[PDB]
């Protein structure tokens, strides 16, 4: 029968190996961008490069962009990667929702996982802010 | 047999529980981002944080990006949530249309709700602009 959707059912469209490769590709792109910016110019520190890569993956307009050819090559290749990956995710999710193998409105049980992840992220961010605040005085 | 799509039929791809939880998540993320950017160091007031969260959810970017670590964690989790939600909406709407056609362009009746929402928003914006005009001068 129609199986109960899991907490992390939103990871179904892409294989877990693909997710792991995406995480390592994100880390590698950030490291390469940081090295290129530092050795061949700093606006692009390690944390700022991580933020740039994360914002590029989520298709959100970042506040800083590379201003050299060597960094812009990384930026363009990363944008192409993220566009292809997001298109593949959307297409695979649509294929999953069209043909059912063992259509009504999407239930909240299918996307409860991202709500749990969002709440956990907000709690972790509040904890980090508190830690930084108490450390700043000392 | 005959049928005609009703107003606000574009809300079918996501259950009303999902929409309500999206509204609550929007307000919560905006308030938490304001909190972590006020007691600890910016431009992220309550209204500006609400605007940033609204812009991030609509995939339309923003004029200002968070700088603090907690603010960036909030931004990242919000971007992930909105990416998943938009992908799910598009995929399930595609599933609805494919199943409907399997048993033909979209008519104006399917997005009449969106146009009515736009007209109401413009009217409310003009009304609030008039109210601000009277209030600010005094």
């Amino acid at each position: 029968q129609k199986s109960k959707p899991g907490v992390f059912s939103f990871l179904d469209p892409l294989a877990y190996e693909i997710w792991m490769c995406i995480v390592f590709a994100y880390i590698g792109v950030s490291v390469v961008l940081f090295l290129v910016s530092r050795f061949s110019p700093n606006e692009f520190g390690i944390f700022n490069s991580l933020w740039f890569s994360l914002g590029a993956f989520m298709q959100q307009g970042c506040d800083i962009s590379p201003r050299s050819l060597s960094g812009r090559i990384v930026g363009g290749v990363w944008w192409f990667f993220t566009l292809i990956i997001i298109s593949s995710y959307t297409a695979n999710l649509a294929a999953f929702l069209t043909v059912e193998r063992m259509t009504s409105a999407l239930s909240l049980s299918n996307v409860a996982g991202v709500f749990y992840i969002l709440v956990g992220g907000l709690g972790l961010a509040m904890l980090v802010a508190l830690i930084e605040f108490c450390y700043k005085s000392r | 047999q005959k049928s005609k799509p009703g107003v606000f039929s574009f809300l079918d791809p996501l259950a009303y529980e999902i929409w309500m939880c999206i509204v609550f998540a929007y307000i919560g993320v905006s308030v938490v981002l304001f909190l972590v950017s006020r007691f600890s160091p910016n431009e992220f007031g309550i209204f500006n944080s609400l605007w940033f969260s609204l812009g991030a959810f609509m995939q339309q970017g923003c004029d200002i990006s968070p700088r603090s670590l907690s603010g960036r964690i909030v931004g990242g989790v919000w971007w992930f949530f909105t990416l998943i939600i938009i992908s799910s909406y598009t995929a399930n709407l595609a599933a609805f249309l494919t199943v409907e056609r399997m048993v033909s362009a979209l008519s104006l009746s399917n997005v009449a709700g969106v146009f009515y929402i736009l007209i109401g928003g413009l009217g409310l914006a003009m009304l609030v602009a008039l109210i601000e005009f009277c209030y600010k001068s005094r």
Binding site: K2, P5, L108, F115 | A25, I27, V32, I46
Partner: protein
């Protein structure tokens, strides 16, 4: 600044009342089953009452029904703790904020009141999401017509979340103004 304090305390009081009533009442969801009404009942958070069917007029504590609805009754108990947690958090925020207003010399109370209000709002959101997810996951496995509809206690909780978050924002601004003063 006095107006901001008054509105913050008012919003805290309304949030506390709206969650206390929501927890204390027993109209979270109405569910009915019958063959095309075998029975029709309303269930809260701890007790269920039947307003139609063979056993009409009897209120049963969470322990005459198909297995699916009884599994739903079980699954509500899993999401039970979060409304209590949010109620405790908002009550602590209310008392700490009132103690802050009655003692203007001490200014740190507003910040902790805002933090507690915001945490209570997040906890309430988590509880509502978990409750709805459990209900939907249970009905999706159902194997006769089955109709369920949310009640006014759920609307009370939904409005109380917004009231808590407004109170938290007002408390944060009150703390900022107090430190500036």
């Amino acid at each position: 600044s006095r107006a901001l304090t008054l509105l913050s305390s008012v919003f805290g009081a309304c949030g506390l009342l709206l969650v206390g009533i929501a927890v204390s009442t027993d109209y979270w969801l109405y569910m009915e089953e019958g063959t095309v009404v075998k029975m029709a009942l309303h269930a809260g958070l701890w007790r269920v009452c039947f307003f139609a069917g063979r056993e009409k007029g009897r209120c049963v504590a969470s322990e005459l029904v198909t297995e699916n609805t009884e599994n739903i009754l079980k699954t509500v108990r899993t999401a039970t703790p979060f409304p209590m947690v949010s109620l405790f958090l908002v009550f602590t925020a209310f008392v700490i904020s009132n103690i802050g207003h009655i003692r203007p010399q001490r200014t740190i109370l507003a910040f902790v009141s805002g933090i507690f209000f915001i945490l209570s709002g997040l906890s309430l959101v988590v509880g509502l999401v978990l409750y709805i997810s459990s209900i939907n996951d249970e009905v999706m496995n159902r194997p006769q017509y089955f109709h369920y509809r949310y009640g006014w206690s759920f609307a009370f909780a939904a409005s109380s979340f917004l009231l808590k978050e407004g109170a938290g924002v007002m408390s944060v601004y009150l703390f900022t103004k107090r430190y500036a003063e």
